Write a protein that binds this DNA or RNA. Structure first.
Ligand SMILES: CC(C)[C@H](N)C(=O)NS(=O)(=O)NC[C@H]1O[C@@H](n2cnc3c(N)ncnc32)[C@H](O)[C@@H]1O
Ligand SMILES: [Zn+2]
Ligand SMILES: [Zn+2]
Length: 862
RNA sequence: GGGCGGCUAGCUCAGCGGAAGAGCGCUCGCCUCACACGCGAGAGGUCGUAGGUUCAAGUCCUACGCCGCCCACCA
């Protein structure tokens, strides 16, 4: 230890960080010690980490460390997700376009430049986690697209397909013409946008009118029906007729369908299964063949589509589409409208729809496999308000498009016969094998589905791929049911649920026993932090500024009840300052046991007191940990250390140490040890350094959690008396306007036994000597247990003392009032605890006793 | 159209059945021999509104007001 005046994290954290880095706390399946597993949500290989991750891992670590030094096999599996679509963009964008030109460099040369990036990003994400003191079993650092993990999927899929649950069909997909790939519902965002609702109307079989309000004119040629509410007979007895469609000679049928909102626009809507979910939905509800007018390039084309219209853009198609309607006489009511435009969450551009042959996943059945457990009580949720939010998500899911046209992910394992047009999917038992001859036409000429899987598909496969489950390992046998899953609600659906499935399905069990959802950190402005919003702060920028233990402590302190966390540097200071205080407290004890000269070894009230108040702490804090409530423990320990050890104990011991009392210096050393234990999970670095310098022990991390020892009742009530006498005098001087150091003689009344026995402390702390004889005239301070009378010797600020005391009375009588009322209240005396009542009765007894004391003094004073 | 979270001291946030709390800021004193990233003494809240349940309600029930999320197929 170097013991300067102030603590410099930079002289400490980096070394310990490296020590822990190069020598991970490797997990042992055969440890024969109860395990504790936590799967680290693998950060996306997109850039660096941000304060969000920090809160996420910092929370995890503190759990690992606690359990570890609590006696378990702390297994925390680290890893990083390739992100798929995400990373894709990142490289494609910035790096490439900016770098020079994304301009297709081949499906190969591109995959190169991506891994290169995967290295930088993946490398950085690790430094960061290391430097934040992540005690992660880096010996098992898994990467979604590493050999061992790629197998977990290629197998998982195969076992799905041949199980039926994974099919291939034309169900329509949300397609982004920017990234040229399909997305999932959860991957597409819909954000209101100013548009133009057009009401078009057209001919009818025999008669003549039908009016329709559509946001997209182009999708008319692809119409297949006019939908009309089933009960809106209203302006609807043209139900069952036909309808030339604007510009065409095509005759669509007017049908009824429950999804028609009679009150929106004209009580009837156009129908286009080939270009929209609602329509496609109703379309198949009455069986109507799909029909495209616009392709994947987002350009017009097709049967119906009119000449001269087929060609250019999808939007520059509606421009002329409208004109060719009004100026042709089919347009009627054009008007503004706030449309719920759907866009690509990761590129912006608005999606589109299309029927395409894709890989889907019968969620309906799976979801039930899971709900089976949840219902039984298999999994526990921290806020607990998420159980329902989870269960309800499953309660109504839709088959998920697993395939993707990205160049990143796992190239799905399906082979298509260039002769029989049949799919060949490796069987589970030989899953690793590549079919070579179509098991249909028996032909050799095969072709593999060059699609790719959904990043979320591999990720949902984690509490298994990290434990080598593509196989049947011992790690997996030793500790599969993770004990606590830590993550922020932002991915409760596309991450947690997904896993709960692949988990409850590929093992008859829960991937984890408890899901701990924490809030999100967000820029001071209140909005979520993410590379997306462009509002991210590198956690290291903060470590460098306040220090890693600080950052860790703030973040945990604030992660109360799954609530979010608004960025507020003030809290970082709060933390740094607390590090420094803890540090100083140690510096004191080290510099004290310096050249100490033992003159005696006598138990002191202060000693007995801190040992007791410590047992209290140890109990309380453990329980808070045993409730995953770190945020609270974080402040319960702040309290203990700062208000009970530094503010009172250390100071109370200063004298005894000058007097060469070994029993005290001993206690200081022993108590400080435990505190360094308690604080370790949150602040590992500083807390280790100190413990080393204090006990010579090299790895606090491996030490055992403290056990609550004593609990001296009287001793605590005794020392309290002292605190009061001390603070009484302190206040008296304050009010009197006397400087701190000013020597003073005062007189005590009441539970004074404590002050008398431990006189030197009282003297040292108050800077006052005791008076044998109660002074005639004097300034008075009334405490709950003791009363102080300060002789009128000297120049004193009586006005202040007066004011201050005139005000205590105002309050003391006010309390007496409340008490009186309660005691004399109906139902309180009777229907209320035989304790909370006799106490309220005692509060009154002494609220008066004090009021009188002041009153009398207050008047007595000239 | 559904659910959910928030609404407590000037600021940022805890507390959720029995006498209103913390950090910072502020007022007054202190370079008191671990710490000025500090020490001591204070000021400052009818806990968003309206109702109830309860002997007892920031703390539970019920509407509502704003703020923000999530899930939704009003074309
Ligand atoms: C399979 C998933 C783990 C996926 N690879 C993924 O979520 N990758 S990530 O980079 O977004 N890391 C997300 C994890 O970090 C948490 N997180 C991300 N942003 C924040 C934030 N602003 N506040 C609090 N927590 C946040 C997520 O809860 C998740 O555990
Ligand atoms: Zn896109
Ligand atoms: Zn074949």
């Amino acid at each position: 230890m170097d013991l300067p005046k102030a603590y410099d994290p930079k002289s400490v954290e980096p070394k310990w960080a490296e020590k822990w880095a190069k020598n991970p706390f490797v997990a042992n399946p055969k440890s024969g010690k109860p395990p504790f597993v936590i799967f680290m949500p693998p950060p996306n290989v997109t850039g660096s980490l941000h304060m969000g991750h920090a809160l996420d891992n910092s929370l995890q670590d503190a759990l690992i460390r606690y359990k570890r030094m609590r006696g378990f096999e702390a297994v925390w599996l680290p890893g990083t997700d390739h992100a798929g679509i995400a990373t894709q963009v990142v490289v494609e964008r910035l790096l490439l376009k900016e770098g020079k030109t994304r301009h297709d460099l081949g499906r190969e040369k591109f995959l190169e430049r991506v891994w290169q990036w995967k290295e930088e990003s993946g490398g950085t994400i690790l430094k960061q986690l290391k430097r934040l003191g992540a005690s992660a079993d880096w010996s098992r650092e898994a990467f979604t697209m590493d050999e061992k993990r790629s197998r977990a999927v290629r197998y998982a899929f195969s076992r799905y397909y041949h199980e039926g649950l994974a099919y291939r069909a034309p169900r329509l997909v949300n397609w982004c013409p920017r990234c040229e790939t399909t997305l999932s519902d959860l991957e597409v965002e819909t954000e209101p946008t100013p548009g133009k609702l057009y009401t078009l109307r057209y001919e009818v079989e025999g008669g003549g009118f039908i009016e329709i309000a559509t946001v997209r004119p182009e999708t008319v040629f692809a119409d297949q029906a006019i939908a009309v509410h089933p009960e809106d007979e209203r302006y609807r007895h043209l139900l069952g007729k036909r309808a030339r469609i604007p510009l065409t000679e095509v005759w669509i049928p007017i049908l009824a369908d429950p999804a028609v909102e009679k009150d929106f626009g004209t009580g009837a809507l156009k129908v286009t299964p080939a270009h929209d979910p609602l329509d496609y939905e109703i379309g198949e509800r009455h069986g109507l063949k799909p029909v495209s007018v616009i392709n994947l390039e987002g350009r017009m084309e097709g049967e119906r589509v009119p000449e001269a219209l087929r060609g250019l853009d999808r939007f520059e198609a509606r421009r002329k589409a409208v004109e060719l309607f009004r100026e042709a006489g089919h347009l009627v009511k054009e008007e503004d409208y706030t449309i719920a435009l759907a866009t690509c969450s990761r590129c912006g551009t608005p999606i589109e729809y299309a029927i395409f042959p894709q890989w889907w996943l019968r969620m309906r059945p799976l979801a039930e496999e899971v709900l089976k457990g949840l219902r039984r009580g298999d999994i526990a949720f921290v806020p607990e308000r998420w159980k329902k939010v989870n269960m309800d998500w499953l309660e109504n899911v839709k088959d998920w498009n697993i395939s993707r046209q990205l160049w990143w992910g796992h190239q799905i394992p399906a082979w298509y016969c260039e002769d029989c047009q049949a799919v060949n999917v490796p069987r589970p038992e030989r899953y690793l094998e590549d079919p070579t001859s179509c098991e249909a036409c028996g032909s050799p000429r095969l072709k593999r589905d060059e699609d790719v899987f959904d990043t979320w598909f591999s990720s949902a496969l984690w509490p298994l791929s990290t434990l080598g489950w593509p196989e049947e390992t011992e790690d997996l046998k030793a500790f599969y049911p993770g004990d606590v899953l830590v993550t922020g609600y932002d991915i409760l659906f596309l991450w947690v649920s997904r896993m709960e499935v692949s988990g409850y399905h590929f093992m008859g069990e829960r991937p984890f026993k408890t899901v701990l959802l924490h809030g999100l950190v967000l820029d001071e402005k209140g909005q979520k932090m993410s590379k997306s919003k462009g509002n991210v702060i590198d956690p290291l920028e903060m470590v460098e500024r306040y220090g890693a233990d600080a950052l860790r402590f703030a973040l945990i302190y604030l992660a109360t009840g799954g609530q979010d966390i608004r960025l507020d540097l003030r809290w970082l200071e709060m933390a740094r300052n607390f590090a420094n205080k803890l540090y100083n407290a140690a510096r004191f004890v080290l510099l004290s046991r310096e050249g100490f000269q033992a003159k005696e070894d006598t138990p002191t009230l202060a000693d007995r007191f801190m040992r007791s108040r410590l047992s209290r702490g140890v109990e309380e804090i453990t329980a808070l940990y045993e409730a995953l409530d770190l945020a609270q423990a974080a402040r319960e320990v702040y309290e203990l250390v700062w208000s009970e050890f530094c503010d009172w104990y250390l100071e109370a011991a200063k004298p005894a140490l000058k007097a060469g009392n070994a029993h005290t210096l001993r206690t200081l050393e022993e108590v400080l040890a435990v505190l360094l234990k308690l604080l370790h999970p949150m602040m590992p670095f500083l807390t280790s350094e100190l413990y080393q310098a204090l006990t010579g022990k090299e790895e606090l991390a491996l030490e055992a959690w403290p056990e609550p020892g004593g609990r001296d009742e009287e001793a605590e009530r005794a020392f309290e008396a002292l605190k009061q006498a001390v603070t009484a005098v302190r206040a008296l001087k304050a009010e009197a306007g006397l400087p701190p150091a000013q020597e003073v003689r005062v007189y005590l009344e009441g539970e004074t036994a404590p002050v008398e026995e431990n006189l030197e402390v009282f003297r040292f702390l108050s800077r006052a000597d005791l008076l044998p004889e109660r002074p005639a005239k004097a300034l008075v301070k009334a405490m709950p247990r003791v009363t102080a009378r300060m002789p009128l010797e000297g120049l004193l600020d009586v006005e202040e003392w007066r004011r201050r005391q005139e005000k205590r009375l105002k309050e003391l009588l006010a309390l007496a009032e409340r008490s009186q009322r309660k005691l004399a209240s109906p139902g309180f005396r009777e229907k209320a605890p035989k304790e909370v009542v006799e106490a309220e009765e005692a509060r009154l007894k002494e609220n008066l006793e004090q009021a009188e004391r002041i009153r009398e003094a207050l008047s007595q004073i000239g």
